[PDB]
Design a protein around this ligand. Structure first.
Ligand code: LNR
Length: 144
């Protein structure tokens, strides 16, 4: 199940807000709890119960930009998600990550790994100016 599959099975009320969703705007609700669990699983960033996976993010985050705060932020946000209902866990992890200083590098890792799995870039693709245009053209084709 891909990020594209997840968005296809969005309810009308959220499909109309795809573009907000895809710029990582936070939207509350049990439907968004569901969807974010879906995408976070699709890109492999969380376990089945929705707990963030430190080891899926640490190096990729530091490789994009080296920052000791990545460690701290990962531990914090795993800290948080472990304390909430499972139905909610992935979304809390993701919300916490976005609000931390790691959020901006997280979006890049996320972007790069969506596009790597979709086959649009090579596995070793870095976050370059070309990549930003590729992701722009990728979103435009989805009406975003
Ligand atoms: N361009 C953003 C895109 O990769 C994206 C981010 C977050 C999401 O929850 C999503 O469905 C898509």
């Amino acid at each position: 199940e891909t990020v594209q599959d997840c968005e296809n099975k969005l309810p009308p009320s959220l499909k109309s807000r795809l573009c907000e969703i895809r710029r990582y705007e936070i939207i509350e609700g049990p439907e968004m709890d569901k969807h974010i669990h879906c995408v976070m699983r699709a890109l492999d960033f969380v376990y089945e119960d929705g707990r963030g996976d430190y080891h899926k993010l640490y190096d990729p985050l530091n490789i994009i930009e080296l920052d000791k705060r990545h460690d701290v932020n990962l531990e914090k946000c795993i800290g948080e998600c472990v304390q909430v209902p499972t139905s909610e866990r992935a979304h809390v992890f993701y919300k916490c990550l976005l609000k931390s200083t790691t959020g901006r590098t997280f979006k890049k890792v996320f972007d790069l790994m969506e596009l790597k799995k979709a086959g649009k870039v090579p596995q070793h693709q870095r976050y370059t100016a070309e990549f930003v245009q590729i992701m722009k053209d990728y979103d435009k084709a989805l009406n975003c």
